[PDB]
Design a protein around this ligand. Structure first.
Ligand SMILES: COc1cc(-c2nn([C@H]3CC[C@H](N4CCN(C)CC4)CC3)c3ncnc(N)c23)ccc1NC(=O)c1cc2ccccc2n1C
Ligand SMILES: [Ca+2]
Length: 434
């Protein structure tokens, strides 16, 4: 008999899903991935729940101050998000020391400003935890209680856990292919050569974006096999593919991103208020999604700010992964223009051009130059000059992306790592403490 507790409130919106409140316990009847079948102990109702809204009773996940599967760089992002404060903290899974835990605390340095600091939490036998050998605790819960009153060596005494908002509800179960009838397409957001993008609603309670495909050269079955495969390549930095309407014209359904494209966003008023570190943070999120593509041995083919989407919390996600592989020379590598050699390394070239888009708040690449003019300039070894608000070191990344030989271009794994810690010396990623 397996009992889970509700981490968040959930209101049912489908046929068989259960509503519940935070703290509700439930008996697990089935584990089916995204949705579990359960019995509420509160309502005695049987039905489906999102499994990301529950954790085993008394597991660490149930604690306000604990964040499962969260990286150094995400801890920092979350802790730097609106809603938090000096001393805001989390205990999380250690990223570099598998099986152990780390503390992340919101701090403030005069010389640099709001920062997040990291402390290794240490474990062995005894089942105990210490950050510094003298100060020892039986449970993680005792550790947090300590560094809540007074900062015994810590940069900052702990105040309140980091802020969590509720996770995205998973798409309805068994609803990869849906009837068109399930959709209300409410606002045309854009339209072009291959179809349209619309703001829609799926069965009344879910806002989605819908891409409608003009019937083209491509087959129907040939288009769905790619979507089918693309849907399995889920990542936090790729827009979520939810569903498809298989009858012509093909509708593609993704999560809705509140801020539209990175390009429009950068050019908006709020866009122009983003300081360089944030612009750098955006690049790092994009590099992360591309690291993932890279590691799975895939290729985007059409990387640029028009194909990056911004959520309302300002999370960047790569869009149109898969599409340019079924179906703009200024973002394309010379080998790809000249011979059609598209590779992860030609995506790397595109990433450098996008990095320039971000630093220039959406200015077109090679301003005042035509496509032909660009082709020849690059052949003569020209590169865009460093803009004003661009640190030399950020510009060197761009230059490395634009090496004429594709083999000499960095990997996205290395770009991400450079972008992630652009203001942090390796030695300084984790605080010391006697
Ligand atoms: C639902 O499908 C998609 C939707 C979007 C999308 N575009 N826009 C704006 C962006 C600015 C635009 N415009 C810019 C210019 N300004 C001036 C006006 C506004 C208007 C439209 C959005 N706004 C909010 N949420 C969204 N999800 C989107 C992008 C890609 C896909 N599809 C895929 O990614 C995809 C297709 C696909 C096909 C096959 C396999 C995989 C596949 N995938 C992952
Ligand atoms: Ca250190």
């Amino acid at each position: 008999r397996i009992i889970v507790v509700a981490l968040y409130d959930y209101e049912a919106i489908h046929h068989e899903d259960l509503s519940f409140q935070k703290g509700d316990q439930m008996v697990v009847l089935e584990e089916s991935g995204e949705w579990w079948k359960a019995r509420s102990l509160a309502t005695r109702k049987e039905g489906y729940i999102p499994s990301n809204y529950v954790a085993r009773v008394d597991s660490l996940e149930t604690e306000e101050w604990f964040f499962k599967g969260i990286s150094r760089k995400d801890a920092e992002r979350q802790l730097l998000a609106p809603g938090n404060m000096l001393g805001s903290f989390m205990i999380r899974d250690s990223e570099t020391t598998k099986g152990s835990y780390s503390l992340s605390v919101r701090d403030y340095d005069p010389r640099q400003g709001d920062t997040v600091k990291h402390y290794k939490i240490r474990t062995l036998d005894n089942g105990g935890f210490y950050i510094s050998p003298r100060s020892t605790f039986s449970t993680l819960q005792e550790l947090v209680d300590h560094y809540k009153k007074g900062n015994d060596g810590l940069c900052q005494k702990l105040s309140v856990p980091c802020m969590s908002s509720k996770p995205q509800k998973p798409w309805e179960k068994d609803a990869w292919e849906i009837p068109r009838e399930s959709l209300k397409l409410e606002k045309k957001l854009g339209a072009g050569q291959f179809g349209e993008v619309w703001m829609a609603t799926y069965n009344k309670h879910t806002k989605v974006a819908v891409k409608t495909m003009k019937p083209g050269s491509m087959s129907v079955e040939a288009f769905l096999a790619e979507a089918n495969v693309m849907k399995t390549l889920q990542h936090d930095k790729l827009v979520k593919l939810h569903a498809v309407v298989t009858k012509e014209p093909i509708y593609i359904i993704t999560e809705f991103m509140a801020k539209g494209s990175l390009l429009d966003f950068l050019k908006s008023d709020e866009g122009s208020k983003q300081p360089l570190p944030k612009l750098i943070d955006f690049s790092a999120q994009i590099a992360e999604g591309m690291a993932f593509i890279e590691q799975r041995n895939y290729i985007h083919r059409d990387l640029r700010a028009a194909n990056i989407l911004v959520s309302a919390s300002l999370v960047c996600k790569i869009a149109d992964f898969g599409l340019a592989r079924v179906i703009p020379i200024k973002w394309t590598a010379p080998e790809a223009i000249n011979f059609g050699s598209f590779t992860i390394k030609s995506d790397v070239w595109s990433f450098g051009i996008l990095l320039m888009e971000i630093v220039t708040y959406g200015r077109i690449p090679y301003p005042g130059m035509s496509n032909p003019e660009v082709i020849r300039a690059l052949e003569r070894g020209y590169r865009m000059p460093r803009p004003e608000n661009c640190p030399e070191e950020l510009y060197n990344i761009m230059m490395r992306c634009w090496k004429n030989r594709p083999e000499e271009r960095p990997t996205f794994e290395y770009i991400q790592s450079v972008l992630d810690d652009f203001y942090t010396a390796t030695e300084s990623q984790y605080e010391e403490i006697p």
